[PDB]
Amino acid sequence: DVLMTQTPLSLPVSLGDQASISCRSSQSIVHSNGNTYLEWYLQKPGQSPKLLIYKVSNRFSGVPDRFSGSGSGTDFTLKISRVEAEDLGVYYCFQGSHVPWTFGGGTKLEIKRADAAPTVSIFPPSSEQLTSGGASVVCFLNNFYPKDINVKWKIDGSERQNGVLNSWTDQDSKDSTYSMSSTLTLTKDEYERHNSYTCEATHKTSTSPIVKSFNRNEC
Amino acid sequence: QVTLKESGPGILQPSQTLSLTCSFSGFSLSTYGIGVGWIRQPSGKGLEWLAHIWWNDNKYYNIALRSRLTISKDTSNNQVFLKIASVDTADTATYYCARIPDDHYFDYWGQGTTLTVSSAKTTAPSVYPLAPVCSSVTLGCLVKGYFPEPVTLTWNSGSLSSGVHTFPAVLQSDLYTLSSSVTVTSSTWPSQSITCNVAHPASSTKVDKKIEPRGPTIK
């Protein structure tokens, strides 16, 4: 039960940039046989993880000269010096020294770009859905940077916490931005009472929030 | 050569017994030091080691689950079987089997079978079109209440690809939900029909949803 701690959770790096992932265990990971068993796996989206560095420093099959592993006892570090397209994904430091064998939380190597503000798009519940009995209110926050965002739902001004379901896309292959959907699910009876529906969004691009709203009157 | 393929039930009811087979080629478990292990990855989260067996039949299990876990090899036909007893929604993950090349760690992982533990019954998706409230235009498509995963969504039968944002599925209640935004020039839509196509292989349900502009309706 060794606690593996990675730093950072998300790594924003440009291409050709020097990148360094930090791993730190709760205890000494030197196995009885003298060998330290620190491994580095790279899992690309929609794939099984693949080994890079084994035994703190040794490179695996087809792992380039660019990847280098270091550290001892507690603090360990992986260095990727000239970041390429193939080199992006989720990295995990693993230990084979003590049973139970444990993996790290994971570090996501992502590409940094210029700051971009989201495009909020509020969608009232469809005619097709209201006839059936439900009333989901969709909100899309599209193409923004950095990944960290926050959405507040305000029904008639009053904030709602419970009944919200959010999903986030990966980084864009083309424009390198993130997108987020936020669905406030409601019963028709609840929806048929209130009027103003607001999907208030906050992002570092601007000090004041990005309000997007509709009224149940017209639609 | 080195290949690891894992066979699973893929989908089963709570409290049933999960039984999976890691079939392999390119190496034998009859060879020295060689070992095969099991790791599970829950739906977009970090990895977790379950158990493993060595060439000499020494079995190591996660102290966390232990009692439910039973691992056994079959040296003659290059197969390893992991069996977890009385499973629950907490065991909805992707299960990978990986080879241990002497030293304490994994080197070659397999494709990894995906298991889903749920009481839910097979349900076709309800496609809801999202037209904007009563230049560029943002349209949506809400696929709701389907089982099991996965669903495949396209716009204009794959013709429309630019500015498309399919979001990952969120477990609504006993069933999944997902959305996909599409952004087009104000001259493309309404003028030219935008149709959201959904396909649910499990329920053999292929649906086309023409997203028309939001019309008025008073009760």
Residue numbers in the entry:
A (entry chain B): 1 to 219
B (entry chain A): 1 to 134, 140 to 224
Please share excerpts from the published article on this structure:
ErbB4 (HER4) is a member of the ErbB subfamily of receptor tyrosine kinases (RTK) that also includes EGFR (also known as ErbB1 or HER1), ErbB2 (c-Neu, HER2) and ErbB3 (HER3). Similar to other RTKs, ligand interaction with ErbB4 promotes receptor dimerization, kinase activation, and initiation of phosphorylation-dependent signaling cascades, such as the mitogen-activated protein kinase (MAPK) and phosphoinositide 3-kinase (PI3-K)/Akt pathways. In addition to promoting these indirect signaling cascades, ErbB4 has been demonstrated to relay signals from the cell surface by releasing a soluble intracellular domain (ICD) fragment, in a process called regulated intramembrane proteolysis (RIP). RIP involves shedding of the ErbB4 extracellular domain via the activity of tumor necrosis factor-alpha converting enzyme (TACE/ADAM17) generating a substrate for a secondary cleavage at the plasma membrane by γ-secretase activity.
Finally, we demonstrate by X-ray crystallography and mutagenesis studies that mAb 1479 binds to the C-terminal region of ErbB4 subdomain IV at a site encompassing JM-a-specific residues. These observations indicate that ErbB4 is cleaved in a subset of breast cancer tissues in vivo, and that mAbs targeted at ErbB4 may be a potential therapeutic option to suppress ErbB4 cleavage.
